[PDB]
Design a binder for this molecule. Structure first.
Ligand SMILES: [Zn+2]
Lengths: 97, 596
């Protein structure tokens, strides 16, 4: 979406997370914004001694290269359970004689 | 918890916001280099202000971070390049008057105007004046007068200022826990921690001096040739046993001898290789020559480039109201933003230079995946070297003939190639004399081995015996020769150009035996050399995570610099110089002076 999502002044809207204490299980949405505690001293909820905000903005600009421009990703996952399986898929038809 | 994790977190952050800040700073820079407007000056200033402020804050807070208990051998480089105590050790007032004294000295250099006698109106800034007089006139009196005026009106003003600045730099170096400021710059080459591949701060002194001594006969024959040409031109002003005049070398500092090429050419009947009229005939522009060089890089297997190159970088002179610099430079705006600045003109020099900065583009691209403080070469001399290797390799007439610049009917001749070799000797070999002179001179000056009252006199002895340059007009301690140089007016290490000159020939030879070239080294091309292209990629893909000694061992297998390629590439030139000088005196005397 380099044509659209890249604005000249900088699309400072969206966020990445880069520091986390541990990994995450598949398929859960975590919205924790607590300051990462890299050092042994407490963060006290503010940036400081080995303490930084885990979320930083994209800061996209049109000048960015192909490998840095925004990309929209959609993941479709199918789940089959003990249900009559409503969503099936299209069925064709032909003229009758 | 251990400190290594804290260091990793901090360095990752530092990379993040540092690359961000550098991105917008370079965006403003590429704004300015194409438009001259005041708010652009303002926002460059304040963006650099945040740059410096946050860098200083991070460096100060990381100064407390030690080095003993941090492993991985690469974070160590990050810490070493991030600590950077520098001049911040001393008091704030000391930094203040250091800043103002550097401002005053740089302004004095820039605002050094030479006014003609008996008319204080037609003053010259050396930008519109002597720069063309030296290259288009051969007047002894005018050159001598301008030389004396430049070394008198300028150096006398800041000779005590130069002494004070040198004392201040040595004092801050001593407070930096180094023996002297020369060692302070030598610390950039400090390499340790890996067995066998270490490098000391005194090894460079020894091997450079030994290599200079080995090369010395080549300079002796070159100086004899130049002196013989000088008697052929001015037999009434140069002694056959004395030293050459200072203002007859080709330039004021003795750096370039190319200005005498048209005077020192033995075979002027045969023109050199110049196909600018050819490309004018096909009406080639910057776009066409750049596509030519693009597929030339393709031929060595190097990949194409993205769109931002050509819908972001503008490659002409804007003229009209938009004012831009015409000094061609490749700008690394950071994080996939690569641009080129050049005013397009029809010239072979512009052709080779354009090859030069686009090779630099690939150079900077090579280490695009490294952490922020690692986006440079293992050393600094690799830069303008790797930039120029491909241009010099393509300078061979075979490459020009293949791509249509040179007609197939043009048979290669020994005279033109010997003329090219002599042009090289006057251009590239001529940089070494002033290089080692100034460089060793500053190493002995900053070591405290030269008395203050006998400084200027101490400048002359080796100048009369090593480089063989005798002053047309005697100079006392009032004069200040180094103050006349621009490259020291901004306080940069001059070793860079010597490293480039000595590394380059080794590089093209390495490429040649990588390409299995057969025959003379001066008839070797890097076209269709994809294996050497990928090997060079492997060489440049490291960055600043390993010693440059390992890079030299990777390219050819040597942990110490080799001067054999320099001799093998000029064996024909050496033989021709010997043949030419076999009927002329060899050597010079250090006692003769033109002023008696
Ligand atoms: Zn270069």
């Amino acid at each position: 979406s380099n044509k659209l999502d890249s604005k000249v002044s900088g699309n400072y809207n969206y966020l990445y997370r880069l520091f986390r204490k541990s990994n995450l299980k598949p398929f859960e949405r975590d919205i924790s914004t607590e300051i990462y505690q890299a050092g042994n001293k407490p963060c006290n909820g503010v940036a400081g001694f080995n303490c930084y905000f885990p979320l930083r903005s994209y800061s996209f600009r049109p000048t960015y290269g192909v490998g840095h421009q925004p990309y929209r990703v959609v993941v479709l996952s199918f789940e089959l359970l003990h249900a009559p399986a409503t969503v099936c898929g299209p069925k064709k038809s032909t003229n009758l004689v | 918890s251990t400190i290594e994790e804290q260091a990793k977190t901090f360095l990752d952050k530092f990379n993040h916001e540092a690359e961000d800040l550098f991105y917008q700073s370079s965006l403003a820079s590429w704004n300015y280099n194409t438009n001259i407007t005041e708010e652009n000056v303002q926002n460059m200033n304040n963006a650099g202000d945040k740059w410096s402020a946050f860098l200083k804050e991070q460096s100060t807070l990381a100064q407390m971070y030690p080095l003993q208990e941090i492993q991985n051998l690469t974070v160590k480089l990050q810490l070493q390049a991030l600590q950077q105590n520098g001049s911040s050790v001393l008091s704030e007032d000391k930094s203040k008057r250091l800043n103002t004294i550097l401002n005053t000295m740089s302004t004095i250099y820039s605002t050094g105007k030479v006014c003609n006698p008996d008319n204080p109106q037609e003053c010259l800034l050396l930008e519109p004046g002597l720069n063309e007089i030296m290259a288009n006139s051969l007047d002894y009196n005018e050159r001598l007068w301008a030389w004396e005026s430049w070394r008198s009106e300028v150096g006398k003003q800041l000779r005590p200022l130069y002494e004070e600045y040198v004392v201040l730099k040595n004092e801050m170096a001593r407070a930096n826990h180094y023996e002297d400021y020369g060692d302070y710059w030598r610390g950039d080459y400090e390499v340790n921690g890996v067995d066998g591949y270490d490098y000391s701060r005194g090894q460079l002194i020894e091997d450079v001096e030994h290599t200079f001594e080995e090369i010395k006969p080549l300079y002796e024959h070159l100086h004899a040739y130049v002196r013989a040409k000088l008697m052929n031109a001015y037999p009434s002003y140069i002694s056959p046993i004395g030293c050459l005049p200072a203002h007859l070398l080709g330039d004021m500092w003795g750096r370039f001898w190319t200005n005498l090429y048209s005077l020192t050419v033995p075979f002027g009947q045969k023109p050199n290789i110049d196909v600018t009229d050819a490309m004018v005939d096909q009406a080639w522009d910057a776009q066409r020559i750049f596509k030519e060089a693009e597929k030339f890089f393709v031929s060595v297997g190097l990949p194409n480039m993205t769109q931002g190159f050509w819908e972001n970088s503008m490659l002409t002179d804007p003229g009209n109201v938009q004012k831009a610099v015409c000094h061609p430079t490749a700008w690394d705006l950071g994080k996939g933003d690569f641009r080129i600045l050049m005013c397009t003109k029809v010239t072979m020099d512009d052709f080779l230079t354009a090859h030069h900065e686009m090779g630099h583009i690939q150079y900077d691209m090579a280490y695009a995946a490294q952490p922020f403080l690692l986006r440079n070469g293992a050393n600094e001399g690799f830069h303008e070297a790797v930039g120029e290797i491909m241009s010099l390799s393509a300078a061979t007439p075979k490459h020009l003939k293949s791509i249509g610049l040179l007609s197939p009917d043009f048979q290669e001749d020994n005279e033109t190639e010997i003329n090219f070799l002599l042009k090289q000797a006057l251009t590239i070999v001529g940089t070494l004399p002033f290089t080692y002179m100034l460089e060793k001179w500053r190493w002995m000056v900053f070591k405290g081995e030269i008395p203050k009252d006998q400084w200027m006199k101490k400048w002359w002895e080796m100048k009369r015996e090593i480089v063989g340059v005798v002053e047309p007009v005697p100079h006392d301690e009032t004069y200040c020769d180094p103050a006349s140089l621009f490259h020291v007016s901004n306080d940069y290490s001059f070793i860079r150009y010597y490293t480039r000159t000595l590394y380059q020939f080794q590089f093209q030879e390495a490429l040649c035996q990588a390409a299995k070239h057969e025959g003379p080294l001066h008839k070797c091309d890097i076209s269709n050399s994809t294996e050497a292209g990928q090997k060079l990629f492997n060489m440049l893909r490291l960055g600043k995570s390993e010693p440059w000694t390992l890079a030299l061992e990777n390219v050819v297998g040597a942990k110490n610099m080799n001067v054999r390629p320099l001799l093998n590439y000029f064996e024909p030139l050496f033989t021709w110089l010997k043949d030419q000088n076999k009927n002329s005196f060899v050597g010079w005397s250090t006692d003769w002076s033109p002023y008696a």
